[PDB]
Amino acid sequence: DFSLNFDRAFLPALYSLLFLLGLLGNGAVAAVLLSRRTALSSTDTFLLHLAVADTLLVLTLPLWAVDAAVQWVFGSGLCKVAGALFNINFYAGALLLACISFDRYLNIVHATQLYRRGPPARVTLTCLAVWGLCLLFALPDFIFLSAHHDERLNATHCQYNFPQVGRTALRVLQLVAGFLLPLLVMAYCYAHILAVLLVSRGQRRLRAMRLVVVVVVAFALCWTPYHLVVLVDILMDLGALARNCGRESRVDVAKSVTSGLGYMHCCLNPLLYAFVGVKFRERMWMLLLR
Ligand SMILES: NCCCC[C@H](NC(=O)[C@@H]1Cc2ccccc2CN1C(=O)CCC(=O)c1ccccc1)C(=O)NCC(c1ccccc1)c1ccccc1
């Protein structure tokens, strides 16, 4: 019962603070961006969509906190709705970070082949593609997610009724599409950005390099701890390890803590991609004056 009590005494407050801070940060980013009368640049649009995704993901948190505390008490319909929202927004966030990195790489590395004389380079096509792909990936949540009434704990939670092979397949898709592909795209793009910036000439390059390194390190540190534990759980399930109660409890608590840390990244997104740029701070100041 150690894992259950730890969840009870630790998830409510953490998710409450995440909810407050995410609603106050990503909402502020969204408002600052939507306050713009003129056009919005490519990275501005991607940041807007990222802010919306993070807002929804944090919005669904308190229901999950209640789930951890006592039990699901909203029926299966809200189980399905919340799960779909969660997965859609998580995948959207990952792919939007990858798209932001690719846009930065295109603008800085291939700087002389994409030059434009101050037009709006509309990028809504990729945003629609991202959202459609996220819906396609979340379909299984729409299909399977239900609220089983456990006869072992007498509880009632939002869990999948997949077959075991299905659970492993969904875990593998999570790992591949949410972590590995975004991480590789980010790594390539930002390594090339650094390679270009080290051989550039200016005084603004230093902050750019530091920001790039911080962004990559933040993503890696925040998300690796959870995906590594997910890989350990896959290894256990496929027979690569021996099951026991103590290991089960360790895995459960580790998953809880690592997931908390991971959603802390969607909490921190405003502090890295939005508030550090002079453009966004100027827009924020203008808005607050208004
Ligand atoms: N043993 C019971 C809990 C097993 C799931 C595990 N729950 C947690 O750890 C914490 C703490 C915790 C404690 C005890 C009971 C419940 C929870 C809920 N948690 C949450 O925050 C929400 C998760 C959730 O109910 C959910 C999310 C999406 C769709 C449907 C449901 C977890 O793995 N959650 C994050 C994970 C994931 C969730 C569901 C299915 C597959 C994976 C994830 C999803 C997307 C991106 C990254 C990670």
Short mmCIF file of C-alpha atoms and ligand atoms in Angstrom, two decimals:
data_model
loop_
_atom_site.label_atom_id
_atom_site.label_comp_id
_atom_site.label_asym_id
_atom_site.label_seq_id
_atom_site.Cartn_x
_atom_site.Cartn_y
_atom_site.Cartn_z
CA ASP A 1 0.00 0.00 0.00
CA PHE A 2 3.09 2.22 0.12
CA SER A 3 2.78 3.30 -3.52
CA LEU A 4 -0.91 4.14 -3.16
CA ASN A 5 -0.38 6.27 -0.05
CA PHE A 6 2.58 8.03 -1.68
CA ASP A 7 0.40 8.86 -4.67
CA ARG A 8 -2.39 10.07 -2.39
CA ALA A 9 -0.16 12.40 -0.36
CA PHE A 10 1.91 13.69 -3.31
CA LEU A 11 -0.16 13.94 -6.53
CA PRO A 12 -2.93 16.34 -5.42
CA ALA A 13 -0.71 19.26 -4.44
CA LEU A 14 1.76 18.81 -7.30
CA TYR A 15 -1.00 18.71 -9.90
CA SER A 16 -2.72 21.70 -8.28
CA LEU A 17 0.44 23.79 -8.50
CA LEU A 18 1.05 22.63 -12.06
CA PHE A 19 -2.51 23.60 -12.98
CA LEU A 20 -2.22 27.09 -11.49
CA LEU A 21 1.20 27.84 -12.96
CA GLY A 22 0.39 26.40 -16.40
CA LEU A 23 -2.88 28.31 -16.63
CA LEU A 24 -1.08 31.50 -15.61
CA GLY A 25 1.86 31.03 -17.99
CA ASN A 26 0.55 29.39 -21.15
CA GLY A 27 -2.64 31.44 -20.95
CA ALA A 28 -0.51 34.58 -20.74
CA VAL A 29 1.51 33.47 -23.77
CA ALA A 30 -1.67 32.76 -25.73
CA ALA A 31 -3.20 36.12 -24.82
CA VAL A 32 -0.01 38.03 -25.65
CA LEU A 33 0.14 36.36 -29.05
CA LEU A 34 -3.58 36.69 -29.87
CA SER A 35 -3.43 40.39 -28.97
CA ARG A 36 -1.46 40.96 -32.20
CA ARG A 37 -3.29 42.94 -34.88
CA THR A 38 -0.71 42.36 -37.61
CA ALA A 39 0.51 39.02 -38.94
CA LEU A 40 2.41 36.43 -36.89
CA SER A 41 5.70 34.84 -37.88
CA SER A 42 6.20 31.09 -38.26
CA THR A 43 7.68 30.46 -34.83
CA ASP A 44 5.03 32.74 -33.32
CA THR A 45 2.27 30.54 -34.76
CA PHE A 46 3.99 27.37 -33.59
CA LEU A 47 4.38 28.86 -30.11
CA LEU A 48 0.69 29.78 -30.11
CA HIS A 49 -0.34 26.22 -30.91
CA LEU A 50 2.12 24.86 -28.34
CA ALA A 51 0.62 27.17 -25.72
CA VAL A 52 -2.88 25.94 -26.54
CA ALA A 53 -1.74 22.32 -26.29
CA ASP A 54 -0.04 22.87 -22.93
CA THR A 55 -3.10 24.73 -21.64
CA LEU A 56 -5.37 21.80 -22.47
CA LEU A 57 -2.95 19.23 -21.05
CA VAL A 58 -2.69 21.07 -17.73
CA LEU A 59 -6.45 21.68 -17.75
CA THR A 60 -7.10 17.95 -17.69
CA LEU A 61 -4.74 17.47 -14.72
CA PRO A 62 -7.11 18.00 -11.74
CA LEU A 63 -9.41 15.19 -12.91
CA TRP A 64 -6.40 12.88 -12.87
CA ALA A 65 -5.45 14.18 -9.43
CA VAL A 66 -8.92 13.23 -8.19
CA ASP A 67 -8.47 9.85 -9.86
CA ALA A 68 -5.21 9.30 -7.98
CA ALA A 69 -6.74 10.46 -4.71
CA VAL A 70 -9.94 8.41 -4.41
CA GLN A 71 -11.42 7.11 -7.66
CA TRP A 72 -12.99 8.04 -10.97
CA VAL A 73 -16.50 9.35 -10.27
CA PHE A 74 -17.44 10.91 -13.63
CA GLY A 75 -18.31 7.74 -15.56
CA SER A 76 -16.67 6.24 -18.63
CA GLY A 77 -17.61 9.09 -20.97
CA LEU A 78 -15.41 11.61 -19.22
CA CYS A 79 -12.73 8.92 -18.93
CA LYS A 80 -12.62 8.67 -22.72
CA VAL A 81 -12.82 12.43 -23.25
CA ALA A 82 -10.02 13.19 -20.80
CA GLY A 83 -7.78 10.45 -22.18
CA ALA A 84 -8.26 11.64 -25.74
CA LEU A 85 -7.51 15.23 -24.75
CA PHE A 86 -4.39 14.15 -22.85
CA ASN A 87 -2.87 12.05 -25.63
CA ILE A 88 -3.78 14.48 -28.41
CA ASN A 89 -2.17 17.37 -26.55
CA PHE A 90 0.94 15.41 -25.57
CA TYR A 91 1.66 14.33 -29.14
CA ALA A 92 0.86 17.83 -30.39
CA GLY A 93 3.34 19.31 -27.94
CA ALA A 94 6.12 16.95 -28.97
CA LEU A 95 5.56 17.45 -32.70
CA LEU A 96 5.25 21.21 -32.23
CA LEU A 97 8.60 21.36 -30.46
CA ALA A 98 10.08 19.39 -33.36
CA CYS A 99 8.48 21.80 -35.84
CA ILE A 100 9.84 24.81 -33.94
CA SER A 101 13.32 23.31 -34.08
CA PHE A 102 12.98 22.66 -37.81
CA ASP A 103 11.80 26.22 -38.45
CA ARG A 104 14.76 27.58 -36.50
CA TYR A 105 17.12 25.36 -38.50
CA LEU A 106 15.59 26.49 -41.79
CA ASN A 107 15.78 30.18 -40.87
CA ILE A 108 19.34 30.15 -39.49
CA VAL A 109 21.19 27.47 -41.48
CA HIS A 110 19.56 27.87 -44.91
CA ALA A 111 19.28 31.60 -44.31
CA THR A 112 20.12 32.73 -47.85
CA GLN A 113 17.77 30.29 -49.64
CA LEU A 114 14.57 31.14 -47.72
CA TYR A 115 14.97 34.93 -47.68
CA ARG A 116 11.70 36.87 -47.87
CA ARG A 117 11.18 40.64 -48.05
CA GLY A 118 8.94 40.81 -44.99
CA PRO A 119 5.93 38.80 -46.11
CA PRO A 120 3.94 36.51 -43.83
CA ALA A 121 5.22 32.99 -44.52
CA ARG A 122 2.00 31.19 -43.60
CA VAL A 123 2.70 27.84 -41.97
CA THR A 124 -0.84 26.71 -41.12
CA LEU A 125 -0.44 23.65 -43.36
CA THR A 126 2.03 22.03 -40.98
CA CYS A 127 -0.08 22.92 -37.94
CA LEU A 128 -3.11 21.23 -39.48
CA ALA A 129 -0.96 18.23 -40.39
CA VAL A 130 0.31 18.00 -36.81
CA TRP A 131 -3.17 18.18 -35.32
CA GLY A 132 -4.59 15.62 -37.75
CA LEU A 133 -1.74 13.22 -37.04
CA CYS A 134 -2.29 13.66 -33.30
CA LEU A 135 -5.98 12.82 -33.71
CA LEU A 136 -5.01 9.75 -35.74
CA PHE A 137 -2.65 8.62 -32.97
CA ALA A 138 -5.24 9.28 -30.24
CA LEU A 139 -7.97 7.25 -31.98
CA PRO A 140 -7.24 4.16 -29.81
CA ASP A 141 -8.00 6.23 -26.71
CA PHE A 142 -11.37 7.12 -28.21
CA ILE A 143 -11.92 3.43 -28.89
CA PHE A 144 -10.82 1.54 -25.79
CA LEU A 145 -10.53 3.80 -22.73
CA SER A 146 -13.10 2.90 -20.07
CA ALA A 147 -13.57 2.97 -16.28
CA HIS A 148 -13.14 -0.54 -14.90
CA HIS A 149 -14.38 -1.42 -11.41
CA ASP A 150 -11.48 -3.34 -9.89
CA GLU A 151 -12.45 -6.28 -7.69
CA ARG A 152 -8.97 -6.36 -6.10
CA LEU A 153 -8.86 -2.78 -4.77
CA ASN A 154 -12.58 -1.91 -5.02
CA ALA A 155 -11.45 1.27 -6.79
CA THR A 156 -12.53 2.79 -10.13
CA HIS A 157 -9.94 4.35 -12.43
CA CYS A 158 -9.49 5.46 -16.05
CA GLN A 159 -7.60 2.55 -17.64
CA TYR A 160 -7.34 0.85 -21.02
CA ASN A 161 -8.87 -2.57 -21.65
CA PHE A 162 -6.41 -3.27 -24.50
CA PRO A 163 -4.92 -6.72 -24.99
CA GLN A 164 -1.41 -7.05 -23.61
CA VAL A 165 0.11 -6.87 -27.10
CA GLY A 166 -1.92 -3.71 -27.59
CA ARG A 167 -0.52 -2.17 -24.41
CA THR A 168 3.04 -2.91 -25.51
CA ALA A 169 2.36 -1.55 -29.00
CA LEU A 170 0.92 1.68 -27.62
CA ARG A 171 3.92 2.06 -25.32
CA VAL A 172 6.28 1.56 -28.27
CA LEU A 173 4.40 4.14 -30.34
CA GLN A 174 4.57 6.58 -27.42
CA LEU A 175 8.32 6.08 -27.19
CA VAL A 176 8.97 6.33 -30.93
CA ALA A 177 6.69 9.23 -31.89
CA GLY A 178 6.77 11.30 -28.70
CA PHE A 179 10.41 10.97 -27.67
CA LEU A 180 12.77 9.42 -30.20
CA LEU A 181 11.67 11.20 -33.38
CA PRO A 182 11.26 14.66 -31.76
CA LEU A 183 14.55 14.22 -29.92
CA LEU A 184 16.44 13.26 -33.07
CA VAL A 185 14.96 16.12 -35.10
CA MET A 186 15.75 18.58 -32.31
CA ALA A 187 19.29 17.23 -31.95
CA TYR A 188 20.03 17.47 -35.67
CA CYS A 189 18.54 20.94 -36.07
CA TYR A 190 20.15 22.46 -32.98
CA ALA A 191 23.54 20.86 -33.61
CA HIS A 192 23.53 22.46 -37.06
CA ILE A 193 22.39 25.77 -35.56
CA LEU A 194 25.35 25.65 -33.18
CA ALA A 195 27.70 24.72 -36.02
CA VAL A 196 26.52 27.77 -37.96
CA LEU A 197 26.62 30.11 -34.96
CA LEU A 198 30.16 29.23 -33.84
CA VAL A 199 31.43 30.43 -37.24
CA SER A 200 29.19 33.51 -37.34
CA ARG A 201 30.11 37.10 -36.44
CA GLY A 202 28.13 39.00 -33.83
CA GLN A 203 27.44 39.66 -30.17
CA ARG A 204 23.96 38.09 -30.10
CA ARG A 205 25.25 34.62 -30.99
CA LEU A 206 26.30 33.79 -27.42
CA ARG A 207 22.80 34.03 -25.96
CA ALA A 208 21.48 32.03 -28.91
CA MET A 209 23.96 29.23 -28.25
CA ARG A 210 23.19 29.16 -24.54
CA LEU A 211 19.44 29.14 -25.21
CA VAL A 212 19.74 26.29 -27.71
CA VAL A 213 21.76 24.18 -25.29
CA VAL A 214 19.35 24.94 -22.45
CA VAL A 215 16.32 24.01 -24.57
CA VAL A 216 17.79 20.68 -25.67
CA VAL A 217 18.98 19.82 -22.17
CA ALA A 218 15.62 20.77 -20.66
CA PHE A 219 13.70 18.53 -23.04
CA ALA A 220 16.10 15.62 -22.50
CA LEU A 221 16.22 15.91 -18.70
CA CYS A 222 12.47 16.33 -18.34
CA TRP A 223 11.38 13.49 -20.61
CA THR A 224 14.13 10.83 -20.50
CA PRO A 225 13.45 9.80 -16.86
CA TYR A 226 9.91 8.70 -17.74
CA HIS A 227 10.65 6.99 -21.06
CA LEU A 228 13.55 5.04 -19.55
CA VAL A 229 11.21 3.71 -16.85
CA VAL A 230 8.63 2.90 -19.53
CA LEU A 231 11.31 0.91 -21.34
CA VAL A 232 12.09 -0.91 -18.09
CA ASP A 233 8.39 -1.74 -17.72
CA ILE A 234 8.26 -3.01 -21.31
CA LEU A 235 11.29 -5.19 -20.59
CA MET A 236 9.55 -6.59 -17.51
CA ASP A 237 6.32 -7.26 -19.43
CA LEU A 238 8.01 -8.98 -22.39
CA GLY A 239 9.84 -11.36 -20.03
CA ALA A 240 13.25 -9.69 -19.83
CA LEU A 241 12.96 -9.39 -16.03
CA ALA A 242 11.36 -11.15 -13.06
CA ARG A 243 8.21 -9.71 -11.49
CA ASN A 244 7.78 -9.11 -7.76
CA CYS A 245 5.65 -6.92 -5.51
CA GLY A 246 8.53 -4.70 -4.44
CA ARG A 247 9.61 -4.10 -8.03
CA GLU A 248 5.99 -3.40 -8.99
CA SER A 249 5.69 -0.73 -6.30
CA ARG A 250 9.06 0.77 -7.26
CA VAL A 251 7.94 0.96 -10.89
CA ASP A 252 4.62 2.55 -9.95
CA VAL A 253 6.17 5.26 -7.79
CA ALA A 254 8.91 5.91 -10.36
CA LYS A 255 6.30 6.30 -13.09
CA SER A 256 4.33 8.72 -10.91
CA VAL A 257 7.35 10.90 -10.13
CA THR A 258 8.71 10.83 -13.68
CA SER A 259 5.31 11.74 -15.13
CA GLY A 260 5.11 14.66 -12.73
CA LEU A 261 8.53 15.79 -13.87
CA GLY A 262 7.48 15.39 -17.50
CA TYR A 263 4.40 17.57 -17.15
CA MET A 264 6.64 20.09 -15.40
CA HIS A 265 8.17 20.54 -18.86
CA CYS A 266 4.84 21.62 -20.34
CA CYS A 267 4.61 23.90 -17.31
CA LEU A 268 8.04 25.39 -18.12
CA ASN A 269 7.44 25.78 -21.87
CA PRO A 270 6.51 29.49 -21.49
CA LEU A 271 9.73 30.19 -19.60
CA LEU A 272 11.95 28.80 -22.39
CA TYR A 273 10.27 29.32 -25.77
CA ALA A 274 8.24 32.45 -25.04
CA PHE A 275 9.52 34.82 -22.36
CA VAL A 276 13.23 34.66 -23.22
CA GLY A 277 12.90 36.37 -26.62
CA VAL A 278 13.04 40.15 -26.74
CA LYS A 279 10.18 40.22 -29.24
CA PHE A 280 7.83 38.43 -26.86
CA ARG A 281 8.82 40.56 -23.88
CA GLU A 282 8.21 43.72 -25.91
CA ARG A 283 4.79 42.39 -26.88
CA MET A 284 4.08 41.51 -23.24
CA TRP A 285 5.00 45.01 -22.11
CA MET A 286 2.83 46.60 -24.79
CA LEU A 287 -0.10 44.40 -23.78
CA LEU A 288 0.26 45.10 -20.05
CA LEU A 289 0.33 48.83 -20.84
CA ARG A 290 -2.90 48.38 -22.81
N1 LIG B 1 -1.21 2.87 -11.93
C1 LIG B 1 -2.35 3.76 -12.27
C2 LIG B 1 -1.93 4.87 -13.20
C3 LIG B 1 -1.36 4.35 -14.51
C4 LIG B 1 -1.01 5.44 -15.52
C5 LIG B 1 0.09 6.38 -15.04
N2 LIG B 1 -0.44 7.46 -14.22
C6 LIG B 1 0.38 8.30 -13.58
O1 LIG B 1 1.59 8.15 -13.55
C7 LIG B 1 -0.27 9.50 -12.88
C8 LIG B 1 -0.36 9.26 -11.38
C9 LIG B 1 -1.48 8.34 -11.01
C10 LIG B 1 -1.37 7.47 -9.92
C11 LIG B 1 -2.41 6.63 -9.57
C12 LIG B 1 -3.57 6.63 -10.31
C13 LIG B 1 -3.70 7.48 -11.40
C14 LIG B 1 -2.67 8.34 -11.76
C15 LIG B 1 -2.84 9.26 -12.93
N3 LIG B 1 -1.59 9.86 -13.42
C16 LIG B 1 -1.61 10.79 -14.40
O2 LIG B 1 -0.80 11.70 -14.42
C17 LIG B 1 -2.68 10.67 -15.47
C18 LIG B 1 -2.52 9.38 -16.26
C19 LIG B 1 -3.85 8.82 -16.69
O3 LIG B 1 -4.61 8.33 -15.87
C20 LIG B 1 -4.22 8.86 -18.14
C21 LIG B 1 -3.51 9.64 -19.04
C22 LIG B 1 -3.85 9.64 -20.39
C23 LIG B 1 -4.89 8.86 -20.84
C24 LIG B 1 -5.60 8.08 -19.95
C25 LIG B 1 -5.27 8.07 -18.61
C26 LIG B 1 0.85 6.97 -16.23
O4 LIG B 1 1.72 6.33 -16.81
N4 LIG B 1 0.49 8.21 -16.60
C27 LIG B 1 1.10 8.95 -17.69
C28 LIG B 1 1.30 8.15 -18.98
C29 LIG B 1 0.18 7.20 -19.40
C30 LIG B 1 -1.09 7.30 -18.86
C31 LIG B 1 -2.10 6.43 -19.26
C32 LIG B 1 -1.84 5.46 -20.20
C33 LIG B 1 -0.58 5.35 -20.74
C34 LIG B 1 0.43 6.21 -20.34
C35 LIG B 1 1.66 9.10 -20.11
C36 LIG B 1 0.74 9.43 -21.09
C37 LIG B 1 1.07 10.30 -22.11
C38 LIG B 1 2.33 10.86 -22.16
C39 LIG B 1 3.26 10.55 -21.19
C40 LIG B 1 2.93 9.67 -20.17
#
